[PDB]
Amino acid sequence: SDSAINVMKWKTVSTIFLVVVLYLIIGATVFKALEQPQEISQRTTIVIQREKFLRAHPCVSDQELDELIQQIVAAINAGSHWDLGCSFFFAGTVITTIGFGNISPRTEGGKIFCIIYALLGIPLFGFLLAGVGDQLGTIFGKGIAKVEDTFIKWNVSQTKIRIISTIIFILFGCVLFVALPAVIFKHIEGWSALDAIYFVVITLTTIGFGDYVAGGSDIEYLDFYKPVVWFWILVGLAYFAAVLSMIGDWLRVIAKKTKEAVGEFRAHAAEWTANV
Amino acid sequence: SDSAINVMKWKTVSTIFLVVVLYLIIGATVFKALEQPQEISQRTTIVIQREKFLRAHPCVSDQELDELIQQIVAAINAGIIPLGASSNQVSHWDLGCSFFFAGTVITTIGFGNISPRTEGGKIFCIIYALLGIPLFGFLLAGVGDQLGTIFGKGIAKVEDTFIKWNVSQTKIRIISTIIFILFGCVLFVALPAVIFKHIEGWSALDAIYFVVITLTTIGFGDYVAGGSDIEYLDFYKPVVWFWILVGLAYFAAVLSMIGDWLRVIAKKTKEAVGEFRAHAAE
Ligand SMILES: CS(=O)(=O)Nc1ccc(C(=O)NCc2ccc(Cl)cc2Cl)cc1
Ligand SMILES: CS(=O)(=O)Nc1ccc(C(=O)NCc2ccc(Cl)cc2Cl)cc1
Ligand SMILES: CCCCCCCCCCCCCCCC
Ligand SMILES: CCCCCCCCCCCCCCCC
Ligand SMILES: CCCCCCCCCCCCCCCC
Ligand SMILES: CCCCCCCCCCCCCCCC
Ligand SMILES: CCCCCCCCCCCCCCCC
Ligand SMILES: CCCCCCCCCCCCCCCC
Ligand SMILES: CCCCCCCCCCCCCCCC
Ligand SMILES: CCCCCCCCCC
Ligand SMILES: [K+]
Ligand SMILES: [K+]
Ligand SMILES: [K+]
Ligand SMILES: [K+]
Ligand SMILES: [K+]
Ligand SMILES: [K+]
């Protein structure tokens, strides 16, 4: 019966698909409820500023303002952005799949080489990230070999301590790879604390919106700043990969628990109705 | 012997790190050599267009002109169309726009053309990403499994008609990988690129570039399917959703294959360096 396992697979995939669609719907409702008011409050103010500059300076016509805005929009397509270090940063955003998009190619050959460069570099950087994660995991394994010997002899017994080990992992990881770089970014980039943490998360998840980019403004930066951010990205991508995998394992455990809890509720309602 | 394998591991990691740094250097040089000239030729023309209107109206405070451009750029980051002949505008956080945004979040594509401005929006975005990326990983693994089983049903038909006389076991896997790459580039790259070229108005190279940047989850945001205010068949965007799901699975498989090819090439080059050393001109 080869088809039966395919049917089980399709049912599991359909359930996960429905869960993902429902997750997207809930997220859409929440994001709309959070962003619609500010969107309206800024769209009214920009229309106010338009007539504000029409009335504060009668020297500008109504017709020449639209041509000015047209040229400004023509200029936003271009934005040095392709100097020595800018293209290095761009190749980094490409092979890491972060893709901030603040710098993107406009030449046809630029796009062709970007396609080839991504297709070849994403796996290579994957190898590098796997190696870095292995090294970091062996370091943290020496650390847990030190921690699970001083507390493994007295009060708490096992099976429950694997959770404590994961807790120590998450805590020190949020300290080293999130909190400290967030403070450094808050002080150097001029971002807020929430903005810094938001940038850290959007970058280390490889989402990379591009609204916040470390080194992106035209601020003077110390010679060690951007390379240290490179190193932080290297190690933090490994850390966040580990964290996302752990969250996935937790979701797996929760899914099994919820399947058997649905079984429990059904098995109770059944023999409860049968008591006539 | 944990220390011996750890030392071998660190040596391999350092070699891969040097290779990656060299790859980045070469990429940087190529990208600047390709994009700097047009950048300069456009900055000179933008300064020309600047000075044409800078002096044509001396009655403007001229400093507030640059500050106005500053304000316009600060407001364009959210999505504005400040025109007088079209004062009515379309929303970027409506029912389906935020749906598309959540999609870009959990897939880590992150086009960023529309991004949250509220503080609570950013906090919920962090939580939403941290919870959704693994869930979507499960979904993508399931879709890849389904696609692989369909490909297995196809190869069960194909790998029996070509079983002639001299047939080897390992050499037909090459034909399987070839047919895989061909049919995948047809279904997940070529056909959606044609559809995007005709519907979005993009060029062929722009359409293929968008497909590649999106299915690799890079997501610059310069090209977004469904992003303009045209009309769309209403049957367009859900088909793009399905294409993104299956093409993300396909591209994960293809990138893994490219990694395996890189492994083989690295082994061949390591042993070729060994051979070159052992020969070293007679
Ligand atoms: C206006 S600009 O954007 O053209 N200027 C630059 C901006 C940033 C950087 C840079 O190296 N930042 C650290 C870094 C390293 C690797 C990765 Cl993947 C991401 C990041 Cl943020 C360089 C130039
Ligand atoms: C100016 S706007 O950006 O606000 N307008 C829109 C732009 C695009 C879409 C859309 O659904 N495209 C298909 C799609 C689906 C899921 C994912 Cl993850 C990516 C993509 Cl491209 C909707 C609205
Ligand atoms: C106007 C058409 C442009 C076509 C693409 C031009 C750039 C081609 C990329 C050059 C690749 C060089 C590979 C070097 C390998 C070491
Ligand atoms: C055949 C059943 C497959 C299981 C798929 C659904 C299981 C339920 C998953 C529940 C996840 C709840 C946590 C989501 C984030 C709070
Ligand atoms: C951030 C929003 C999280 C809400 C996502 C859904 C939570 C509840 C899902 C319950 C799914 C029940 C399936 C049970 C399968 C046996
Ligand atoms: C179902 C309540 C009204 C919804 C009206 C249209 C919602 C979807 C708009 C299309 C946005 C692209 C999403 C792809 C199809 C779900
Ligand atoms: C005239 C329309 C077709 C011309 C443009 C087709 C795209 C150019 C080739 C696509 C990139 C080549 C993939 C190479 C992968 C190693
Ligand atoms: C100690 C292990 C050394 C092996 C590291 C990789 C060696 C080969 C790297 C060059 C091949 C990958 C890029 C090929 C570009 C065409
Ligand atoms: C498109 C970018 C091409 C980059 C090709 C990198 C070539 C450098 C390979 C380095 C070979 C090192 C061999 C070491 C053997 C122990
Ligand atoms: C989604 C269809 C799969 C059937 C098995 C799961 C029962 C329904 C769960 C929602
Ligand atoms: K990835
Ligand atoms: K991305
Ligand atoms: K982006
Ligand atoms: K990504
Ligand atoms: K991105
Ligand atoms: K963008």
Side-chain angles (χ1 to χ4, degrees), chain A, chain B residues 1-281:
Chain A
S1 54
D2 294 352
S3 195
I5 62 100
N6 293 332
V7 169
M8 287 299 306
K9 283 180 177 176
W10 196 78
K11 287 179 177 177
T12 302
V13 173
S14 60
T15 53
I16 299 171
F17 175 89
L18 288 174
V19 172
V20 168
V21 172
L22 217 156
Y23 193 78
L24 289 171
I25 294 174
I26 291 183
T29 55
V30 174
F31 278 120
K32 178 252 193 62
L34 278 168
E35 298 294 328
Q36 199 87 84
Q38 290 296 327
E39 197 184 8
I40 301 172
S41 73
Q42 293 175 359
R43 280 176 177 170
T44 56
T45 53
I46 197 63
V47 177
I48 287 181
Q49 290 181 354
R50 191 80 173 283
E51 292 187 355
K52 183 265 173 62
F53 277 96
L54 282 180
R55 297 174 65 90
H57 298 83
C59 156
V60 180
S61 300
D62 196 72
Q63 57 183 355
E64 302 168 355
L65 185 50
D66 206 353
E67 297 175 355
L68 169 67
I69 300 179
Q70 279 191 356
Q71 294 183 359
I72 294 177
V73 173
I76 202 65
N77 305 326
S80 178
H81 296 290
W82 291 107
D83 48 67
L84 318 90
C86 283
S87 42
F88 192 83
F89 154 79
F90 172 80
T93 64
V94 169
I95 66 166
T96 63
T97 72
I98 298 176
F100 288 117
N102 56 1
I103 303 303
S104 66
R106 293 286 171 265
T107 308
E108 305 172 358
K111 298 175 186 175
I112 300 174
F113 180 75
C114 188
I115 291 176
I116 293 177
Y117 193 81
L119 285 177
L120 288 178
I122 294 172
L124 182 63
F125 189 84
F127 290 110
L128 173 61
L129 196 61
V132 171
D134 169 72
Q135 285 298 326
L136 195 65
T138 58
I139 296 175
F140 182 73
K142 298 175 183 177
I144 64 174
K146 299 179 296 183
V147 177
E148 295 173 352
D149 184 68
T150 60
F151 290 101
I152 303 291
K153 212 166 299 300
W154 181 245
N155 56 6
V156 285
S157 189
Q158 297 81 20
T159 64
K160 297 181 71 176
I161 306 177
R162 181 56 64 181
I163 303 172
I164 307 173
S165 58
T166 58
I167 287 176
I168 300 171
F169 171 77
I170 297 170
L171 186 64
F172 271 97
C174 291
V175 170
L176 271 66
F177 309 108
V178 180
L180 184 145
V183 175
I184 290 178
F185 293 151
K186 177 177 178 181
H187 279 285
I188 289 183
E189 298 289 339
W191 302 338
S192 71
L194 174 57
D195 286 340
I197 298 175
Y198 171 72
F199 164 80
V200 168
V201 174
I202 295 303
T203 302
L204 292 191
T205 53
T206 68
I207 295 177
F209 290 134
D211 47 355
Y212 289 147
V213 178
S217 56
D218 290 338
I219 295 182
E220 54 95 11
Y221 296 114
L222 304 178
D223 60 347
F224 81 98
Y225 177 71
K226 290 175 184 177
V228 165
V229 184
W230 267 103
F231 169 83
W232 162 76
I233 269 196
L234 185 60
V235 195
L237 285 175
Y239 172 72
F240 255 62
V243 173
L244 294 166
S245 181
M246 280 181 59
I247 295 178
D249 298 332
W250 296 348
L251 291 181
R252 182 176 307 158
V253 170
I254 290 180
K256 298 298 179 170
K257 293 299 179 182
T258 51
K259 288 169 66 178
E260 66 188 7
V262 167
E264 295 282 325
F265 168 74
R266 288 175 180 172
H268 286 95
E271 306 193 26
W272 176 92
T273 308
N275 196 337
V276 182
Chain B
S1 305
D2 293 352
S3 58
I5 61 100
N6 292 331
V7 169
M8 291 300 165
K9 283 178 178 175
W10 199 82
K11 289 177 178 176
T12 303
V13 173
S14 60
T15 53
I16 299 171
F17 174 88
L18 288 174
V19 173
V20 168
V21 172
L22 214 160
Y23 193 78
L24 288 171
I25 294 173
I26 291 183
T29 55
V30 174
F31 278 122
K32 57 187 166 199
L34 277 167
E35 299 293 328
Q36 198 85 84
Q38 291 296 326
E39 196 184 8
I40 301 172
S41 73
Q42 292 175 359
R43 279 179 177 171
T44 55
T45 53
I46 199 63
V47 176
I48 288 181
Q49 290 181 354
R50 188 80 173 282
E51 291 187 355
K52 183 171 185 176
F53 277 95
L54 284 180
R55 297 181 66 88
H57 298 83
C59 25
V60 181
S61 300
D62 198 72
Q63 58 182 355
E64 300 170 356
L65 183 52
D66 207 353
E67 297 175 355
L68 169 67
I69 300 179
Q70 281 190 356
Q71 296 181 359
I72 294 177
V73 173
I76 202 65
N77 305 326
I80 64 163
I81 309 96
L83 301 184
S86 56
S87 56
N88 39 16
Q89 302 155 9
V90 190
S91 179
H92 295 139
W93 288 107
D94 49 68
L95 36 89
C97 282
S98 42
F99 190 82
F100 155 79
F101 173 80
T104 64
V105 169
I106 66 167
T107 63
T108 71
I109 298 176
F111 288 117
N113 55 0
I114 301 303
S115 66
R117 294 286 171 265
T118 308
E119 306 171 358
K122 298 176 186 175
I123 300 174
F124 179 75
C125 188
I126 290 177
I127 293 177
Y128 193 82
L130 286 177
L131 289 178
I133 294 172
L135 182 63
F136 188 84
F138 289 109
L139 173 61
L140 196 62
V143 171
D145 169 72
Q146 285 298 326
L147 196 65
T149 58
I150 296 176
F151 180 75
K153 296 177 182 177
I155 64 174
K157 300 177 296 183
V158 177
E159 296 172 352
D160 185 68
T161 60
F162 289 101
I163 303 291
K164 297 183 179 301
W165 179 246
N166 62 5
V167 166
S168 298
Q169 297 80 21
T170 64
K171 298 179 71 176
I172 306 177
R173 183 54 63 182
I174 303 172
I175 307 173
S176 303
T177 58
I178 287 176
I179 195 175
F180 170 77
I181 297 170
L182 187 146
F183 273 73
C185 292
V186 170
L187 271 66
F188 309 111
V189 180
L191 185 145
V194 175
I195 290 179
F196 294 151
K197 177 177 178 181
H198 279 285
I199 289 184
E200 297 289 339
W202 303 339
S203 71
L205 174 57
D206 285 340
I208 299 175
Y209 171 72
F210 164 80
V211 168
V212 173
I213 295 303
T214 302
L215 292 191
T216 52
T217 68
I218 294 177
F220 290 136
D222 48 355
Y223 292 146
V224 178
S228 56
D229 290 338
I230 296 182
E231 54 95 11
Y232 299 113
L233 304 178
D234 122 286
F235 139 93
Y236 176 72
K237 291 175 184 176
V239 166
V240 184
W241 271 103
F242 170 82
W243 161 75
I244 267 172
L245 185 59
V246 196
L248 284 174
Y250 173 72
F251 255 63
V254 174
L255 294 165
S256 181
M257 280 180 59
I258 295 178
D260 298 332
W261 296 347
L262 290 181
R263 301 162 181 251
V264 170
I265 290 180
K267 300 297 179 170
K268 296 301 179 182
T269 50
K270 204 174 183 64
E271 66 189 7
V273 167
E275 295 282 325
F276 167 74
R277 288 176 180 173
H279 287 95

